[PDB]
PDB file of all heavy atoms in Angstrom:
ATOM      1  N   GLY H 134     -43.855   5.205  32.888  1.00 47.50           N
ATOM      2  CA  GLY H 134     -44.179   4.479  34.135  1.00 47.50           C
ATOM      3  C   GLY H 134     -43.148   4.747  35.206  1.00 47.50           C
ATOM      4  O   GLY H 134     -43.438   4.528  36.432  1.00 47.50           O
ATOM      5  N   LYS H 135     -41.896   5.024  34.830  1.00 53.20           N
ATOM      6  CA  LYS H 135     -40.753   5.055  35.738  1.00 53.20           C
ATOM      7  C   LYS H 135     -39.609   5.826  35.174  1.00 53.20           C
ATOM      8  O   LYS H 135     -39.579   6.164  33.962  1.00 53.20           O
ATOM      9  CB  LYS H 135     -40.378   3.660  36.154  1.00 53.20           C
ATOM     10  CG  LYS H 135     -39.804   2.839  35.176  1.00 53.20           C
ATOM     11  CD  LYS H 135     -39.973   1.334  35.564  1.00 53.20           C
ATOM     12  CE  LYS H 135     -39.390   0.398  34.470  1.00 53.20           C
ATOM     13  NZ  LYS H 135     -37.887   0.347  34.490  1.00 53.20           N
ATOM     14  N   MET H 136     -38.668   6.225  36.025  1.00 55.66           N
ATOM     15  CA  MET H 136     -37.607   7.176  35.629  1.00 55.66           C
ATOM     16  C   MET H 136     -36.791   6.789  34.409  1.00 55.66           C
ATOM     17  O   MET H 136     -36.464   7.566  33.552  1.00 55.66           O
ATOM     18  CB  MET H 136     -36.643   7.494  36.821  1.00 55.66           C
ATOM     19  CG  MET H 136     -37.018   8.620  37.500  1.00 55.66           C
ATOM     20  SD  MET H 136     -37.049  10.136  36.680  1.00 55.66           S
ATOM     21  CE  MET H 136     -35.358  10.670  36.446  1.00 55.66           C
ATOM     22  N   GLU H 137     -36.440   5.511  34.285  1.00 52.01           N
ATOM     23  CA  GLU H 137     -35.639   5.011  33.231  1.00 52.01           C
ATOM     24  C   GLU H 137     -36.302   5.249  31.850  1.00 52.01           C
ATOM     25  O   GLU H 137     -35.615   5.359  30.848  1.00 52.01           O
ATOM     26  CB  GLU H 137     -35.277   3.548  33.366  1.00 52.01           C
ATOM     27  CG  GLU H 137     -34.228   3.315  34.303  1.00 52.01           C
ATOM     28  CD  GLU H 137     -34.692   3.789  35.723  1.00 52.01           C
ATOM     29  OE1 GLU H 137     -35.914   3.523  36.008  1.00 52.01           O
ATOM     30  OE2 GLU H 137     -33.750   4.353  36.439  1.00 52.01           O
ATOM     31  N   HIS H 138     -37.604   5.351  31.796  1.00 50.02           N
ATOM     32  CA  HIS H 138     -38.365   5.573  30.544  1.00 50.02           C
ATOM     33  C   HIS H 138     -38.079   6.913  29.979  1.00 50.02           C
ATOM     34  O   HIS H 138     -38.060   7.087  28.745  1.00 50.02           O
ATOM     35  CB  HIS H 138     -39.836   5.428  30.829  1.00 50.02           C
ATOM     36  CG  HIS H 138     -40.269   4.061  31.176  1.00 50.02           C
ATOM     37  ND1 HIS H 138     -41.452   3.782  31.850  1.00 50.02           N
ATOM     38  CD2 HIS H 138     -39.659   2.890  31.005  1.00 50.02           C
ATOM     39  CE1 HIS H 138     -41.591   2.483  31.982  1.00 50.02           C
ATOM     40  NE2 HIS H 138     -40.489   1.932  31.553  1.00 50.02           N
ATOM     41  N   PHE H 139     -37.790   7.911  30.811  1.00 50.14           N
ATOM     42  CA  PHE H 139     -37.567   9.296  30.319  1.00 50.14           C
ATOM     43  C   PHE H 139     -36.251   9.377  29.624  1.00 50.14           C
ATOM     44  O   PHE H 139     -36.175   9.826  28.450  1.00 50.14           O
ATOM     45  CB  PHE H 139     -37.774  10.310  31.434  1.00 50.14           C
ATOM     46  CG  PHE H 139     -39.042  10.113  32.189  1.00 50.14           C
ATOM     47  CD1 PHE H 139     -39.108   9.729  33.535  1.00 50.14           C
ATOM     48  CD2 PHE H 139     -40.246  10.276  31.505  1.00 50.14           C
ATOM     49  CE1 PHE H 139     -40.319   9.567  34.093  1.00 50.14           C
ATOM     50  CE2 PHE H 139     -41.449  10.087  32.099  1.00 50.14           C
ATOM     51  CZ  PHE H 139     -41.494   9.709  33.407  1.00 50.14           C
ATOM     52  N   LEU H 140     -35.139   8.858  30.222  1.00 50.02           N
ATOM     53  CA  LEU H 140     -33.860   8.791  29.589  1.00 50.02           C
ATOM     54  C   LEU H 140     -33.938   8.111  28.253  1.00 50.02           C
ATOM     55  O   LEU H 140     -33.396   8.553  27.267  1.00 50.02           O
ATOM     56  CB  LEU H 140     -32.805   8.157  30.502  1.00 50.02           C
ATOM     57  CG  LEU H 140     -31.406   7.945  29.959  1.00 50.02           C
ATOM     58  CD1 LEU H 140     -30.837   9.288  29.540  1.00 50.02           C
ATOM     59  CD2 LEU H 140     -30.540   7.141  30.944  1.00 50.02           C
ATOM     60  N   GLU H 141     -34.638   6.967  28.245  1.00 49.44           N
ATOM     61  CA  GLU H 141     -34.839   6.167  27.019  1.00 49.44           C
ATOM     62  C   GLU H 141     -35.415   7.000  25.905  1.00 49.44           C
ATOM     63  O   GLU H 141     -34.955   6.905  24.776  1.00 49.44           O
ATOM     64  CB  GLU H 141     -35.685   4.951  27.329  1.00 49.44           C
ATOM     65  CG  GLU H 141     -35.743   3.948  26.278  1.00 49.44           C
ATOM     66  CD  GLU H 141     -36.625   2.710  26.709  1.00 49.44           C
ATOM     67  OE1 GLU H 141     -37.592   2.861  27.529  1.00 49.44           O
ATOM     68  OE2 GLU H 141     -36.274   1.631  26.252  1.00 49.44           O
ATOM     69  N   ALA H 142     -36.430   7.800  26.183  1.00 50.13           N
ATOM     70  CA  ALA H 142     -37.098   8.693  25.161  1.00 50.13           C
ATOM     71  C   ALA H 142     -36.093   9.672  24.648  1.00 50.13           C
ATOM     72  O   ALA H 142     -36.006   9.916  23.476  1.00 50.13           O
ATOM     73  CB  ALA H 142     -38.342   9.300  25.687  1.00 50.13           C
ATOM     74  N   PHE H 143     -35.382  10.335  25.597  1.00 51.09           N
ATOM     75  CA  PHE H 143     -34.425  11.379  25.166  1.00 51.09           C
ATOM     76  C   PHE H 143     -33.345  10.759  24.283  1.00 51.09           C
ATOM     77  O   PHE H 143     -32.898  11.405  23.322  1.00 51.09           O
ATOM     78  CB  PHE H 143     -33.803  12.074  26.372  1.00 51.09           C
ATOM     79  CG  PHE H 143     -34.737  12.821  27.230  1.00 51.09           C
ATOM     80  CD1 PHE H 143     -34.855  12.662  28.546  1.00 51.09           C
ATOM     81  CD2 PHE H 143     -35.594  13.781  26.630  1.00 51.09           C
ATOM     82  CE1 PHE H 143     -35.718  13.445  29.334  1.00 51.09           C
ATOM     83  CE2 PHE H 143     -36.455  14.523  27.384  1.00 51.09           C
ATOM     84  CZ  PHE H 143     -36.552  14.348  28.752  1.00 51.09           C
ATOM     85  N   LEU H 144     -32.948   9.524  24.586  1.00 53.82           N
ATOM     86  CA  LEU H 144     -31.847   8.916  23.839  1.00 53.82           C
ATOM     87  C   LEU H 144     -32.262   8.609  22.386  1.00 53.82           C
ATOM     88  O   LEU H 144     -31.415   8.521  21.487  1.00 53.82           O
ATOM     89  CB  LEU H 144     -31.336   7.654  24.538  1.00 53.82           C
ATOM     90  CG  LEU H 144     -30.459   7.807  25.790  1.00 53.82           C
ATOM     91  CD1 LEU H 144     -30.293   6.524  26.585  1.00 53.82           C
ATOM     92  CD2 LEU H 144     -29.059   8.417  25.355  1.00 53.82           C
ATOM     93  N   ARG H 145     -33.593   8.462  22.158  1.00 54.45           N
ATOM     94  CA  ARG H 145     -34.072   8.220  20.820  1.00 54.45           C
ATOM     95  C   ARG H 145     -34.387   9.536  20.082  1.00 54.45           C
ATOM     96  O   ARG H 145     -34.748   9.491  18.879  1.00 54.45           O
ATOM     97  CB  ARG H 145     -35.269   7.343  20.788  1.00 54.45           C
ATOM     98  CG  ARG H 145     -35.030   5.875  20.669  1.00 54.45           C
ATOM     99  CD  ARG H 145     -34.108   5.460  21.748  1.00 54.45           C
ATOM    100  NE  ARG H 145     -34.097   4.035  21.923  1.00 54.45           N
ATOM    101  CZ  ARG H 145     -33.310   3.333  22.717  1.00 54.45           C
ATOM    102  NH1 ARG H 145     -32.368   3.928  23.472  1.00 54.45           N
ATOM    103  NH2 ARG H 145     -33.433   2.037  22.698  1.00 54.45           N
ATOM    104  N   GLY H 146     -34.168  10.673  20.734  1.00 52.38           N
ATOM    105  CA  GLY H 146     -34.295  11.955  20.126  1.00 52.38           C
ATOM    106  C   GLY H 146     -35.464  12.779  20.545  1.00 52.38           C
ATOM    107  O   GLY H 146     -35.685  13.907  20.033  1.00 52.38           O
ATOM    108  N   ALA H 147     -36.250  12.320  21.548  1.00 56.89           N
ATOM    109  CA  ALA H 147     -37.248  13.216  22.056  1.00 56.89           C
ATOM    110  C   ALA H 147     -36.631  14.417  22.720  1.00 56.89           C
ATOM    111  O   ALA H 147     -35.599  14.309  23.324  1.00 56.89           O
ATOM    112  CB  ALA H 147     -38.161  12.446  23.123  1.00 56.89           C
ATOM    113  N   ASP H 148     -37.286  15.542  22.603  1.00 55.75           N
ATOM    114  CA  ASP H 148     -36.863  16.781  23.176  1.00 55.75           C
ATOM    115  C   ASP H 148     -37.448  17.034  24.531  1.00 55.75           C
ATOM    116  O   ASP H 148     -36.849  17.696  25.386  1.00 55.75           O
ATOM    117  CB  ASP H 148     -37.113  17.942  22.231  1.00 55.75           C
ATOM    118  CG  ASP H 148     -36.335  17.792  20.920  1.00 55.75           C
ATOM    119  OD1 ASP H 148     -35.124  17.949  20.942  1.00 55.75           O
ATOM    120  OD2 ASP H 148     -37.018  17.442  19.891  1.00 55.75           O
ATOM    121  N   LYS H 149     -38.662  16.562  24.681  1.00 54.87           N
ATOM    122  CA  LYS H 149     -39.433  16.693  25.900  1.00 54.87           C
ATOM    123  C   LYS H 149     -40.172  15.424  26.166  1.00 54.87           C
ATOM    124  O   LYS H 149     -40.453  14.660  25.234  1.00 54.87           O
ATOM    125  CB  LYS H 149     -40.373  17.912  25.844  1.00 54.87           C
ATOM    126  CG  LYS H 149     -39.759  19.213  25.509  1.00 54.87           C
ATOM    127  CD  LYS H 149     -40.766  20.362  25.503  1.00 54.87           C
ATOM    128  CE  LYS H 149     -40.180  21.660  25.157  1.00 54.87           C
ATOM    129  NZ  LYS H 149     -41.128  22.828  25.212  1.00 54.87           N
ATOM    130  N   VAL H 150     -40.608  15.228  27.410  1.00 55.55           N
ATOM    131  CA  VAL H 150     -41.463  14.114  27.821  1.00 55.55           C
ATOM    132  C   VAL H 150     -42.779  14.668  28.443  1.00 55.55           C
ATOM    133  O   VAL H 150     -42.667  15.563  29.220  1.00 55.55           O
ATOM    134  CB  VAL H 150     -40.753  13.102  28.721  1.00 55.55           C
ATOM    135  CG1 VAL H 150     -39.687  12.305  27.938  1.00 55.55           C
ATOM    136  CG2 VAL H 150     -40.163  13.795  29.944  1.00 55.55           C
ATOM    137  N   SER H 151     -43.904  14.105  28.039  1.00 56.21           N
ATOM    138  CA  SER H 151     -45.140  14.444  28.630  1.00 56.21           C
ATOM    139  C   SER H 151     -45.592  13.361  29.604  1.00 56.21           C
ATOM    140  O   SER H 151     -45.471  12.153  29.263  1.00 56.21           O
ATOM    141  CB  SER H 151     -46.262  14.679  27.596  1.00 56.21           C
ATOM    142  OG  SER H 151     -47.491  15.047  28.183  1.00 56.21           O
ATOM    143  N   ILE H 152     -46.123  13.757  30.736  1.00 59.36           N
ATOM    144  CA  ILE H 152     -46.612  12.903  31.782  1.00 59.36           C
ATOM    145  C   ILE H 152     -47.948  13.436  32.255  1.00 59.36           C
ATOM    146  O   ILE H 152     -48.156  14.656  32.318  1.00 59.36           O
ATOM    147  CB  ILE H 152     -45.596  12.617  32.910  1.00 59.36           C
ATOM    148  CG1 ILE H 152     -45.122  13.884  33.518  1.00 59.36           C
ATOM    149  CG2 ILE H 152     -44.500  11.707  32.380  1.00 59.36           C
ATOM    150  CD1 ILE H 152     -44.188  13.615  34.702  1.00 59.36           C
ATOM    151  N   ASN H 153     -48.836  12.515  32.714  1.00 57.04           N
ATOM    152  CA  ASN H 153     -50.176  12.894  33.108  1.00 57.04           C
ATOM    153  C   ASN H 153     -50.572  11.993  34.317  1.00 57.04           C
ATOM    154  O   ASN H 153     -50.266  12.358  35.454  1.00 57.04           O
ATOM    155  CB  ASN H 153     -51.114  12.783  31.931  1.00 57.04           C
ATOM    156  CG  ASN H 153     -52.496  13.256  32.231  1.00 57.04           C
ATOM    157  OD1 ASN H 153     -52.886  13.318  33.422  1.00 57.04           O
ATOM    158  ND2 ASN H 153     -53.285  13.571  31.122  1.00 57.04           N
ATOM    159  N   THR H 154     -51.092  10.835  34.031  1.00 59.55           N
ATOM    160  CA  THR H 154     -51.486   9.926  35.117  1.00 59.55           C
ATOM    161  C   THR H 154     -50.257   9.609  35.963  1.00 59.55           C
ATOM    162  O   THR H 154     -50.298   9.500  37.191  1.00 59.55           O
ATOM    163  CB  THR H 154     -52.161   8.619  34.581  1.00 59.55           C
ATOM    164  OG1 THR H 154     -53.372   9.026  33.920  1.00 59.55           O
ATOM    165  CG2 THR H 154     -52.423   7.635  35.696  1.00 59.55           C
ATOM    166  N   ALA H 155     -49.101   9.389  35.301  1.00 59.02           N
ATOM    167  CA  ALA H 155     -47.911   9.000  36.018  1.00 59.02           C
ATOM    168  C   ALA H 155     -47.494  10.108  37.005  1.00 59.02           C
ATOM    169  O   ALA H 155     -46.990   9.829  38.080  1.00 59.02           O
ATOM    170  CB  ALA H 155     -46.813   8.735  35.008  1.00 59.02           C
ATOM    171  N   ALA H 156     -47.625  11.341  36.576  1.00 58.10           N
ATOM    172  CA  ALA H 156     -47.281  12.503  37.438  1.00 58.10           C
ATOM    173  C   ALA H 156     -48.271  12.593  38.628  1.00 58.10           C
ATOM    174  O   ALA H 156     -47.849  12.860  39.791  1.00 58.10           O
ATOM    175  CB  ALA H 156     -47.316  13.790  36.636  1.00 58.10           C
ATOM    176  N   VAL H 157     -49.537  12.497  38.344  1.00 64.10           N
ATOM    177  CA  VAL H 157     -50.529  12.543  39.440  1.00 64.10           C
ATOM    178  C   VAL H 157     -50.236  11.495  40.548  1.00 64.10           C
ATOM    179  O   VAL H 157     -50.285  11.724  41.756  1.00 64.10           O
ATOM    180  CB  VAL H 157     -51.964  12.475  38.965  1.00 64.10           C
ATOM    181  CG1 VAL H 157     -52.959  12.424  40.096  1.00 64.10           C
ATOM    182  CG2 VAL H 157     -52.239  13.681  38.010  1.00 64.10           C
ATOM    183  N   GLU H 158     -49.967  10.241  40.057  1.00 64.44           N
ATOM    184  CA  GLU H 158     -49.765   9.104  40.946  1.00 64.44           C
ATOM    185  C   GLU H 158     -48.419   9.167  41.601  1.00 64.44           C
ATOM    186  O   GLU H 158     -48.238   8.567  42.680  1.00 64.44           O
ATOM    187  CB  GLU H 158     -49.951   7.800  40.208  1.00 64.44           C
ATOM    188  CG  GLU H 158     -51.412   7.646  39.740  1.00 64.44           C
ATOM    189  CD  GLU H 158     -51.707   6.285  39.130  1.00 64.44           C
ATOM    190  OE1 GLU H 158     -50.777   5.553  38.689  1.00 64.44           O
ATOM    191  OE2 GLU H 158     -52.900   5.988  38.972  1.00 64.44           O
ATOM    192  N   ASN H 159     -47.438   9.858  41.046  1.00 63.62           N
ATOM    193  CA  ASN H 159     -46.130  10.020  41.643  1.00 63.62           C
ATOM    194  C   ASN H 159     -45.582  11.406  41.259  1.00 63.62           C
ATOM    195  O   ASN H 159     -44.727  11.598  40.355  1.00 63.62           O
ATOM    196  CB  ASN H 159     -45.169   8.925  41.230  1.00 63.62           C
ATOM    197  CG  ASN H 159     -43.820   9.025  41.919  1.00 63.62           C
ATOM    198  OD1 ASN H 159     -43.646   9.895  42.799  1.00 63.62           O
ATOM    199  ND2 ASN H 159     -42.873   8.184  41.524  1.00 63.62           N
ATOM    200  N   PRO H 160     -45.995  12.486  42.041  1.00 64.68           N
ATOM    201  CA  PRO H 160     -45.548  13.798  41.678  1.00 64.68           C
ATOM    202  C   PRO H 160     -44.068  13.953  41.668  1.00 64.68           C
ATOM    203  O   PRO H 160     -43.535  14.846  40.917  1.00 64.68           O
ATOM    204  CB  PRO H 160     -46.273  14.655  42.691  1.00 64.68           C
ATOM    205  CG  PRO H 160     -47.533  13.896  42.973  1.00 64.68           C
ATOM    206  CD  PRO H 160     -47.129  12.456  42.968  1.00 64.68           C
ATOM    207  N   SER H 161     -43.321  13.213  42.468  1.00 63.54           N
ATOM    208  CA  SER H 161     -41.877  13.290  42.496  1.00 63.54           C
ATOM    209  C   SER H 161     -41.228  13.029  41.149  1.00 63.54           C
ATOM    210  O   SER H 161     -40.108  13.442  40.921  1.00 63.54           O
ATOM    211  CB  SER H 161     -41.269  12.400  43.549  1.00 63.54           C
ATOM    212  OG  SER H 161     -41.342  11.095  43.284  1.00 63.54           O
ATOM    213  N   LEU H 162     -41.986  12.331  40.227  1.00 58.74           N
ATOM    214  CA  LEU H 162     -41.418  12.144  38.882  1.00 58.74           C
ATOM    215  C   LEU H 162     -41.136  13.447  38.221  1.00 58.74           C
ATOM    216  O   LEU H 162     -40.152  13.646  37.471  1.00 58.74           O
ATOM    217  CB  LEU H 162     -42.294  11.285  38.005  1.00 58.74           C
ATOM    218  CG  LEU H 162     -42.462   9.809  38.354  1.00 58.74           C
ATOM    219  CD1 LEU H 162     -43.455   9.177  37.403  1.00 58.74           C
ATOM    220  CD2 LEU H 162     -41.175   9.106  38.327  1.00 58.74           C
ATOM    221  N   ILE H 163     -42.035  14.466  38.446  1.00 56.67           N
ATOM    222  CA  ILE H 163     -41.813  15.754  37.853  1.00 56.67           C
ATOM    223  C   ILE H 163     -40.494  16.377  38.321  1.00 56.67           C
ATOM    224  O   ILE H 163     -39.627  16.815  37.525  1.00 56.67           O
ATOM    225  CB  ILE H 163     -42.975  16.756  38.111  1.00 56.67           C
ATOM    226  CG1 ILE H 163     -44.295  16.227  37.661  1.00 56.67           C
ATOM    227  CG2 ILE H 163     -42.689  18.135  37.554  1.00 56.67           C
ATOM    228  CD1 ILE H 163     -45.484  17.043  38.201  1.00 56.67           C
ATOM    229  N   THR H 164     -40.353  16.386  39.644  1.00 57.93           N
ATOM    230  CA  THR H 164     -39.103  16.849  40.268  1.00 57.93           C
ATOM    231  C   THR H 164     -37.860  16.132  39.763  1.00 57.93           C
ATOM    232  O   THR H 164     -36.832  16.759  39.381  1.00 57.93           O
ATOM    233  CB  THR H 164     -39.175  16.719  41.772  1.00 57.93           C
ATOM    234  OG1 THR H 164     -40.309  17.470  42.275  1.00 57.93           O
ATOM    235  CG2 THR H 164     -37.842  17.191  42.467  1.00 57.93           C
ATOM    236  N   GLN H 165     -37.942  14.763  39.649  1.00 57.84           N
ATOM    237  CA  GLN H 165     -36.781  13.995  39.250  1.00 57.84           C
ATOM    238  C   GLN H 165     -36.377  14.324  37.781  1.00 57.84           C
ATOM    239  O   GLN H 165     -35.205  14.429  37.487  1.00 57.84           O
ATOM    240  CB  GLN H 165     -37.080  12.515  39.378  1.00 57.84           C
ATOM    241  CG  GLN H 165     -37.192  12.065  40.859  1.00 57.84           C
ATOM    242  CD  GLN H 165     -37.583  10.548  40.916  1.00 57.84           C
ATOM    243  OE1 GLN H 165     -36.805   9.709  40.483  1.00 57.84           O
ATOM    244  NE2 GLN H 165     -38.754  10.282  41.420  1.00 57.84           N
ATOM    245  N   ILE H 166     -37.408  14.399  36.909  1.00 60.44           N
ATOM    246  CA  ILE H 166     -37.062  14.710  35.495  1.00 60.44           C
ATOM    247  C   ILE H 166     -36.434  16.090  35.435  1.00 60.44           C
ATOM    248  O   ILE H 166     -35.478  16.336  34.757  1.00 60.44           O
ATOM    249  CB  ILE H 166     -38.280  14.625  34.587  1.00 60.44           C
ATOM    250  CG1 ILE H 166     -38.816  13.209  34.600  1.00 60.44           C
ATOM    251  CG2 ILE H 166     -37.842  15.005  33.131  1.00 60.44           C
ATOM    252  CD1 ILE H 166     -40.300  13.112  34.077  1.00 60.44           C
ATOM    253  N   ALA H 167     -37.054  17.087  36.132  1.00 63.85           N
ATOM    254  CA  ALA H 167     -36.588  18.446  36.014  1.00 63.85           C
ATOM    255  C   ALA H 167     -35.179  18.652  36.607  1.00 63.85           C
ATOM    256  O   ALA H 167     -34.337  19.400  36.021  1.00 63.85           O
ATOM    257  CB  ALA H 167     -37.615  19.414  36.752  1.00 63.85           C
TER     258      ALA H 167
END
Side-chain angles (χ1 to χ4, degrees):
Chain H
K135 70 201 177 76
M136 263 300 284
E137 282 62 39
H138 293 161
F139 309 114
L140 176 58
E141 191 178 30
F143 297 127
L144 286 166
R145 269 56 165 174
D148 299 288
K149 305 182 181 182
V150 292
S151 182
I152 56 176
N153 185 338
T154 295
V157 175
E158 295 187 341
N159 184 3
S161 70
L162 293 178
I163 304 167
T164 302
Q165 290 177 63
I166 297 161

